[PDB]
Ligand binder design. Structure first.
Ligand SMILES: OC[C@H]1O[C@@H](O[C@H]2[C@H](O)[C@@H](O)[C@H](O[C@H]3[C@H](O)[C@@H](O)[C@H](O[C@H]4[C@H](O)[C@@H](O)[C@H](O[C@H]5[C@H](O)[C@@H](O)[C@H](O)O[C@@H]5CO)O[C@@H]4CO)O[C@@H]3CO)O[C@@H]2CO)[C@H](O)[C@@H](O)[C@@H]1O
Length: 327
């Protein structure tokens, strides 16, 4: 009867505890009692938030160490629902959950996994890099990367769907931010644990919706070559289609591109969607998030503020509802 729901790409190979890395990986459970504690090992500066009976609690970190943290306490004695959310992205380190403790209380039967499922594929925007920063000149701060208030997570909660957030700040299709060497998105996409080489079994999570927001890094400094960019994008779509033949795929642009980088990326992604559509695959769509204009502020290094994430989520929720007929 009692058990735990692991929402995300988790590796269960170590009997000492499940491991994960991607943004928004989360552990969901019911417990009886008045408090709950967890022991977490984290490879780098990871931040977490507990949401208990629908109340988000102050976030906390576990930084390149193993810590036992009392997540919540002083509750009325009874049954309670807990989501434990990894705020921070994969590059800030893998996380292993080494056990929960309920004091005098006990673990209850887990909620069932949600039937509606979304996979997001993206960069800093999807990671919600800097969304709790307060001005665009501020540099990255692990504590301010709140993926629970990413446009992705908000949209998933709007739709009562689970989401896997396969995203990595600075990553592109043809190049990484500023030409930085290293794996590109297709290189990292096949992994559960991108630093320790554990590959994901795609049959384990088949989403009805895939949301792709890539290309900001391909156009934010140097402009990627059109053929190279279009070919990389079609290759990603092919891989998604290989694992999820029936998914509805939303190809997104915005809201951080501007000027000619925005014009080119928009044009190229539109062309990719148009090409798929003329090829008979009618379940590939284009979405544009209007460029941010300062009126909802900026997060660190120009990345979207929570307010901008909420606008994006409003728009993406409507697009998904339209195409899937959800709600
Ligand atoms: O987790 C850590 C992670 O970091 C990754 O690298 C980060 C990198 O460290 C950051 O410096 C970088 O920051 C840049 C943004 O990516 C980029 O989008 C942004 O572009 C700005 C630009 O600087 C600014 O001039 C531009 O202004 C235009 C306005 O937007 C228009 O409204 C107006 O009309 O015209 C002006 C142009 O005149 O705006 C854009 C945004 O729209 O510049 C940031 C640097 O200042 O981000 C990277 C991640 O996204 C690293 O790669 C990872 O490896 C590492 O782990």
């Amino acid at each position: 009867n009692p058990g735990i729901l692991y929402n995300g790409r988790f590796d269960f190979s170590d009997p000492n505890g499940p491991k994960c890395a991607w943004s928004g990986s989360n552990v969901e459970l019911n417990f009886y009692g008045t408090e709950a504690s967890v022991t977490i090992k984290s490879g780098g500066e990871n931040w977490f938030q507990a949401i208990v009976d629908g109340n988000p609690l102050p976030p906390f970190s576990v930084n390149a160490t193993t810590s036992t943290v009392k997540l919540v306490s002083g509750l009325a004695e009874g049954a309670h629902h807990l989501v434990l959310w990894k705020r921070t992205e994969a590059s800030l380190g893998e996380v292993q959950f080494l056990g929960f403790d309920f004091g005098s209380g006990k673990l209850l039967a887990a909620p069932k996994p949600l039937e509606r499922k979304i996979e997001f594929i993206g960069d800093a925007i999807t990671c919600a890099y800097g969304n709790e920063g307060t001005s665009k000149e501020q540099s990255f701060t692990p504590k301010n990367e709140n993926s629970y208030m990413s446009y992705a997570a908000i949209t998933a909660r709007n739709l009562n769907a689970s989401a896997n957030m396969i995203a990595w700040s600075g990553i592109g299709l043809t190049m990484n931010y500023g030409g930085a060497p290293g794996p590109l998105i297709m290189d990292r996409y096949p992994y559960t644990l991108p630093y320790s080489g554990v590959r994901w079994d795609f049959s384990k999570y088949v989403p009805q919706v895939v949301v792709i927001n890539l290309g900001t890094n391909d156009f934010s400094t140097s402009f990627a070559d059109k053929t190279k960019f279009v070919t990389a994008y079609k290759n990603l779509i092919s891989e998604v289609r290989r694992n999820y033949p029936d998914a509805h795929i939303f190809c997104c642009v915005g809201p951080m591109l501007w000027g000619t980088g925005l014009d080119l990326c928009r044009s190229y992604v539109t062309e990719v969607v148009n090409d798929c559509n003329r090829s008979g695959d009618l379940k590939v769509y284009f979405v544009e998030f209007p460029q941010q204009d300062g009126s909802t502020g900026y997060g660190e290094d120009w990345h979207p503020s929570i307010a901008t994430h909420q606008l994006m989520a409003e728009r993406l929720t409507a697009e998904i509802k339209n195409k899937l007929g959800w709600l």
